[PDB]
Ligand binder design. Structure first.
Ligand code: 9I9
Ligand code: 9I9
Ligand code: ZN
Ligand code: ZN
Lengths: 401, 401
């Protein structure tokens, strides 16, 4: 009903097996949703002027030791050896992004440098606590690291906040709770650096007219963060978005740029993820929509179906027209009752069933039925195709009227 | 000089480092090429009616023992541990595809089932034998597995062959050498099975009029194979494409389907890759074109630039029009001589440089120069966008002549 594990099996989206705990086998229709979510995030990366990179799955333990994560999260990390050398399977993309930053001399002119990745990460999570798409070992982050000057933090965090609300609004999430985590007991740098760092986050939120609250002392060793919690239609809370300042990692991994005064400077790093885990976010959307994915996300967006054998060639032509228009379409030409076809494709949550009887063929029209069971009547083929295209392009939550 | 390592560095496509031997860091412009190559393969996967899936990064050694690969190739696999269980970092995507197949009741009607994946694979290759993008440890296979009946092998091998030549021709590779490897001494199945299997591959090639040389006795124990070697402009051989029959793995991993007789039967598996390694193929393409990527592959397709500040608004408007047309375009309004700007974009292998002087603004035109140094003169903006769109959508090797 609103259980992603049930709807997942029903609509053949994914499965999982004990041979690979907390690592998703993505089926055809599930990978289609995942890929369309990737396309959506890429459109925002372009709109917000991000680079997109791809880093390796493993790097030398020696490199991960310099990050500080080895001492604190070695037991959460998958390791493998080759030729007397130990490698970590990446649980995070940040050190990989610094390696790309460190290729070539960097100028103040290159900042802010926004580096995004659909980062395939692995964490050695306890098998006992693995739950569907929500708690996994293998996950994909809508990740990015911004390399910038201290002066650029406010503007860069401002743009991250807009991107968060922009992207959440697409999926109909308008109730957002925002928490700013402040300096912990054990922290790096002066109290002044923290005053300015916390001020930068607070002013960025203020600039966007966003009310928030503090989580006192919950900040990381290496800087303060903003966390965003969205509420689904059941008013259940999901923490997804994070904007994390980092005054540690660049220095640790010898990241530098030639300042405007010609002095070598360490860049500030901003970690940010909006959806968080792509798998978890699909899990949340599955329950939010109860399998009724918005048309732009639907594995199959349209099924064209004949009442009798007589409309088979009209269905073939219309299916080709929809295919050419970039719509994910199937023809249902089975020797079955129109009622049987509608019920089957309604149960599979296909947004639109385009029904062709003799009256539709003769007029060059099509009868449109929604998965909600509404009959929109008979409309011109080209006018329907243009409307379906508009709904998909605009990533509309709503169907045709 | 056409070294992919040199071009990769110069055009900021990728880098590799000692902390990650034989594993690629894709920079913004290299990842753009990678994704366009992915987009191309998907267009073929659709045309040849392939499902696309995603399998897990690692699986229990216990499953890899059932395949028979552990006894033979354990030293060529990366392994990691969790909760007293040994996991193999997948060196191949076949076992994972069988797991997805095994989920849900499969009948004769569901065959042939064509399952494609951009499969992230790892092999523990000696670090001494690594070089460039040609011999790596982490690679992405344009992999697919076809689950079919003995009756369907011929037709399915036929489409595999058509797809291979279809794809190699897109990149201008017409010199293809083909090898069929027959019965080894130690093998499974009857001589009659091998007679039919070797005939299926041989008749498929003969009907397609593909000259091939038999590699007598060099076939795999689990079935025969076709291997495709393409030649670049330096006449260097690259063994990229494979079609391998397998009458072993489906049985070993409990793969079965309900036949026309309503009784269970083991499906025949066809292992099929065309590009082989997406990374090696980009390396070969980089050298083949010496960085002059066809327009559809070019990281940046168009630069629009002004003579003086007077044409700045016309340039920004043309940039937006080209962007809306689906073209990777950048604006160059810098206060630099036209000869300086054109040299920078020519060095970066930008296919098209669009120059806006007063005469271009007045007449609603644009001056078009190719990176080869051909001046196509002053042409109507809309006619140019249509020509560029056509060149990109057709995936033309050639620029406007
Ligand atoms: C935005 C990115 O650039 C950033 N690098 C990052 O990954 N931030 C963390 C949230 N931050 C932390 O948890 C920091 C503390 N922490 C927590 N766990 C760790 C675990 C490991 Cl193995 C390592 Cl190496 C480091 C850490 C570590 O530093 C984050 C943000 C959003 C989603 C997730 C997430 C990760 C895993 C899951 C899953 F396990 F699948 F359920 C779900 C969600 C994590
Ligand atoms: C088409 C696919 O579905 C098929 N499963 C497959 O992977 N075919 C093999 C060619 N076939 C063989 O190599 C068979 C023999 N062989 C050889 N080496 C192995 C090594 C390991 Cl670790 C394992 Cl588990 C199995 C094998 C194994 O079976 C293939 C085809 C094309 C390219 C590659 C390839 C090989 C090496 C690299 C490398 F450079 F190392 F990164 C990159 C790509 C491999
Ligand atoms: Zn990070
Ligand atoms: Zn295979």
């Amino acid at each position: 009903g609103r259980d992603h594990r049930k709807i997942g099996k029903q609509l053949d989206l994914y499965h999982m097996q004990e041979e690979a705990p907390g690592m998703v086998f993505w089926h055809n229709d599930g990978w289609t949703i995942f890929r369309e979510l990737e396309v959506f995030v890429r459109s925002k990366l372009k709109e917000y002027q991000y680079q997109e990179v791809k880093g390796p799955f493993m790097m030398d333990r020696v490199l991960w030791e310099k990050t500080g994560h080895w001492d604190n999260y070695k037991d959460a990390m998958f390791t493998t050896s080759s030729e007397n050398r130990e490698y970590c399977i990446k649980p995070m993309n940040c050190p990989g992004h610094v390696q790309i930053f460190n290729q070539g001399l960097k100028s103040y002119r290159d900042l802010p440098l926004r580096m995004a990745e659909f980062g395939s990460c692995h964490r050695n999570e306890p098998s006992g606590a693995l739950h569907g798409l929500m708690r996994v070992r293998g996950f994909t982050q809508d990740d990015a690291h911004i390399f910038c000057t201290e002066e650029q933090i406010r503007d860069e965090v401002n743009a991250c906040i807009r991107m968060v609300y922009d992207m959440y609004s697409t999926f109909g999430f308008e109730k957002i709770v925002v928490k700013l985590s402040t300096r912990p007991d054990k922290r790096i740098g002066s109290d002044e650096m923290w005053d300015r760092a916390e001020a930068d986050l607070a002013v960025a939120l203020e600039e966007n007219n966003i009310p928030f609250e503090y989580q006192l002392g919950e900040g990381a060793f290496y800087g303060p963060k903003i966390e965003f919690t969205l509420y689904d239609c059941l008013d259940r809370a999901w923490q997804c978005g994070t904007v994390q300042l980092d005054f540690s990692l660049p220095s640790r991994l010898s990241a530098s740029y030639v300042g405007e005064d010609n002095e070598r400077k360490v860049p500030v790093m901003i970690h940010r993820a909006i959806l968080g885990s792509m798998e978890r976010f699909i899990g949340i959307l599955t329950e939010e929509f109860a399998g009724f994915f918005p048309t732009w996300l639907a594995p199959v967006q349209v099924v064209v179906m004949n009442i009798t054998d007589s409309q088979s060639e009209y269905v073939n032509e219309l299916t080709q027209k929809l295919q050419n228009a970039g719509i994910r379409v199937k023809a249902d030409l089975r020797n079955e009752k129109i009622g049987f076809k509608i019920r089957e494709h309604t149960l599979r949550r296909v947004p639109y069933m385009l029904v062709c009887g003799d009256k539709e063929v003769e007029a060059g029209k099509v009868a449109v039925r929604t998965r909600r069971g509404k009959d929109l009547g008979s409309l011109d083929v080209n006018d329907v195709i243009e409307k379906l295209q508009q709904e998909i392009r605009s990533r509309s939550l709503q169907q045709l009227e």
